[PDB]
Ligand binder design. Structure first.
Ligand SMILES: [Ca+2]
Ligand SMILES: [Cl-]
Length: 294
């Protein structure tokens, strides 16, 4: 079903002098769900229940997002990908995941999860992905309509758009979900970002870090690395395709459709497809997991 209620209860743990929030329910091997920008663990609330009893169900809030602590002092050099990865690697380590992890990823969760998976390949049992950064991007991979806005995030205009006006939460988010969100739903997405200024910094630092047209060079290299590895890895994969979709279409989709040992389904959605087809997404993940854990 749909619903505005969160899944499970938020737990907290100290990492690098900051508290990080996460959902961790049940026993066994982890099914590890990673949200991206501008969302949180909340993104998976109607998907995680389909995996009830199939393992340990985990959804972490990235540093500065959801119920995780803000970075202090926050500024234009904080919340880089390398910074998020440092906090996330340490969190995942502290959680004692073992060596049979199923990853479920989206958006920046996919850059982070694909990267982690390449670096910890032996520990990774399966990868389910949707609307993911399969490879370094080009401006031609972006739907025409959304190009100028994303380019403006990556210019001097970005602070006003995002820190002042919360454009990523209030415009991009609902704009890339096909069904209308409820009041309670937008409230939960708005909450980490209620205040103008540095509270919203993660939602602007993220689009500045997107590996597009060669830049930033460190994130491009990481994405080129995992692109090459994923196209060769025999690790089982579930590609959840979306129609009309958003990021994972055209050339990007061409590429991830070359990856080996892969099942695919198509669901209704643009980018944040979890809000459009939760049950279809949840059911495919659960079947995938059942097949990997007979
Ligand atoms: Ca909409
Ligand atoms: Cl972004």
């Amino acid at each position: 079903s749909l619903g505005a209620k969160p899944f499970g209860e938020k737990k907290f743990i100290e990492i690098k002098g900051r508290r990080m929030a996460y959902i961790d329910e049940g026993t066994g091997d982890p099914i590890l769900f990673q949200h991206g920008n501008p969302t949180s663990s909340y993104l998976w609330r109607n998907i995680m229940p389909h995996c009830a009893g199939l393992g340990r169900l985990i959804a972490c809030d990235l540093i500065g997002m959801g119920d995780s602590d803000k970075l202090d002092p926050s500024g234009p050099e904080r919340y880089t990908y390398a910074e998020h990865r440092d906090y996330l690697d340490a969190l995942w380590e502290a959680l004692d995941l073992g060596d049979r992890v199923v990853l479920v990823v989206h958006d920046w969760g996919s850059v982070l999860g694909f990267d982690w998976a390449r670096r910890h390949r032996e520990r990774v049992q399966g990868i389910a992905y949707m609307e993911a950064v399969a490879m370094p991007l080009e401006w031609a991979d972006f739907p025409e309509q959304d190009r100028d806005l994303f380019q403006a995030f990556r210019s001097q205009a970005g602070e006003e758009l995002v820190l002042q006006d919360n454009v990523f939460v209030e415009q991009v988010l609902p704009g890339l979900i096909l069904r209308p969100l409820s009041e309670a739903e937008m409230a939960a997405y708005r909450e980490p970002f209620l205040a103008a200024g540095e509270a919203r910094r993660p939602t602007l630092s993220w689009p500045r870090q997107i590996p597009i047209a060669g830049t930033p060079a460190d994130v491009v290299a990481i994405a080129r690395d995992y692109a090459g590895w994923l196209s060769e890895s025999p690790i089982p994969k579930l590609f959840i395709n979306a129609e009309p979709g958003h990021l994972t279409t055209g050339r990007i989709r061409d590429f991830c459709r070359t990856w080996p040992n892969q099942t695919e389904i198509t669901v209704a959605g643009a980018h944040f497809i979890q809000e459009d087809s939760p049950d279809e997404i949840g059911a495919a993940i659960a079947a995938f997991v059942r097949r990997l854990r007979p």
